[PDB]
Amino acid sequence: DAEFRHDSGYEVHHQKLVFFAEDVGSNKGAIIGLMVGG
Amino acid sequence: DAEFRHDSGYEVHHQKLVFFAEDVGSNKGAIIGLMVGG
Amino acid sequence: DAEFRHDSGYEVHHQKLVFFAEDVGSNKGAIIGLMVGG
Amino acid sequence: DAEFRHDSGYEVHHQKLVFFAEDVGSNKGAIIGLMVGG
Amino acid sequence: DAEFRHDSGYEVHHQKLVFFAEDVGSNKGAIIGLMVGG
Amino acid sequence: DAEFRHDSGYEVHHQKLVFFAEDVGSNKGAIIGLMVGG
Amino acid sequence: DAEFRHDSGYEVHHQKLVFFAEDVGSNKGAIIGLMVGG
Amino acid sequence: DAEFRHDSGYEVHHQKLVFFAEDVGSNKGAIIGLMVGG
Amino acid sequence: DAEFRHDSGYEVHHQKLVFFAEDVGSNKGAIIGLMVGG
Amino acid sequence: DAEFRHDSGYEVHHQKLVFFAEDVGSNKGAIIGLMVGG
Amino acid sequence: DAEFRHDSGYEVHHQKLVFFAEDVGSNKGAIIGLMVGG
Amino acid sequence: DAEFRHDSGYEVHHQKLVFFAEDVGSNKGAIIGLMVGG
């Protein structure tokens, strides 16, 4: 799960970036190419 | 699950970006190509 | 599930982008190509 | 573009799966959330 | 582009899986959240 | 681009898996969250 | 119950305030949110 | 119960304040959020 | 209960304040958040 | 301002109390008995 | 301001109390009995 | 300001109390009985 929050007060600027990310180009907890005999 | 929130106060700027993301190009918890004999 | 919220106060700007996303190009919790003998 | 082909000769089996896929949960070459001032 | 091909000769087996995939949970060459002032 | 090929001769087996994949959970050549002032 | 009384004799002044109050923003002897099983 | 009384004799002044108060922002003898099983 | 009384004789002054108060921001003898099993 | 929320899942009980309150017997931000000469 | 939240999962009990409160018998930020000569 | 949160998982009990409070019988940031000559 993800809980993202951003709260702004008094801000003066030319440029501002806020970047919040969890899974970007990811295979978390994945099973890929499994073989079981029985 | 995802809970995203953004609250603005007093903001003065030329440019501002807020980017919130969870699963971008992802296969979280996926099973791909599994083989079971019995 | 997703719960997205954005609240604006006092904002003055040339450009502003708010981008909220959960599953973009994703196969979360998917089963693809599974084979079971019995 | 896709050019998928499968030819079977002499095959004997309990189970056989052939899985050919392209762009499964994808946004290839897509523009999402773009802003140009002029 | 994809050019997928499979040819079977003399094959005998309990289970056989052939899995050919391209761009599974992908955003290849995508533009997401871009801002240009002019 | 992908050029995937598999040719079977004389094969006898309990289980056989052939897994060919490209760009699985990937953002190759993608632009995410870019800002240019002018 | 309230018994408020003010008697003026010989008084000379720019400003005079007499403030008599009882139960201002009060919940005296109140039952709020009570639960009895039997 | 309140018994408030003020008697003025010979008084000369720029400013005079008499402030008599009882139970200002109070919950005297109140039951809030009580639970009894039986 | 309150019994507040003020009597003025011969008084001459720039400023005079008489402040009589009882239970200002108080929860005297209150029950808050009580639980009994039986 | 007040933002109150309660969400129930799987609940089994003899008795349950949820009590949410902000201003109970309160004079928040109040002016009482002010005197200004000019 | 107040932001109160309660979320229930799997709960089994004889008795449960949740009590959330901010200003109970309070005079926060109040001016009471002020005198200014000019 | 106050931000109160309670999240329940797997709970089994005879009795449970959660009590969250900020200002109970309080005069935070209050001015009471001030006198200024000018």
Author numbering:
A (entry chain F), B (entry chain F), C (entry chain F), D (entry chain A), E (entry chain A), F (entry chain A), ...: 1 to 38
Question: Which sentences did the original study use to describe this structure?
Answer:
We used electron cryo-microscopy (cryo-EM) to determine the structures of Aβ40 filaments from the leptomeninges of individuals with Alzheimer’s disease and cerebral amyloid angiopathy. Filaments are made of pairs of protofilaments, the ordered core of which comprises D1–G38.
There were two main types of filaments, the minority type (type 1) comprising a pair of identical protofilaments and the majority type (type 2) comprising two protofilament pairs running side by side. Pairs of leptomeningeal Aβ40 protofilaments interact through salt bridges between E3 from one dimer and R5 from the other dimer, and vice versa. A similar association of dimeric filaments into tetramers via electrostatic interactions of the surface residues K16 and E22 was observed in Aβ42 Type 1b filaments. Structures from case 1 reached the highest resolution. The structure of filaments made of two pairs of protofilaments were determined at 2.4 Å; the structure of filaments made of one pair of protofilaments was determined at 2.7 Å. All filaments had a right-handed twist, as established from the densities for backbone oxygen atoms in the cryo-EM maps. Cryo-EM structures of type 1 and type 2 filaments, at 3.1 Å and 2.7 Å resolution, respectively, revealed the same Aβ40 fold as observed using sarkosyl extraction. There was a strong density in front of Y10, which was situated at a right angle turn between β1 and β2, which may correspond to a post-translational modification of this residue and/or an external cofactor. There was another strong density opposite a hydrophobic patch made of I31, L34 and V36 in the C-terminal region.
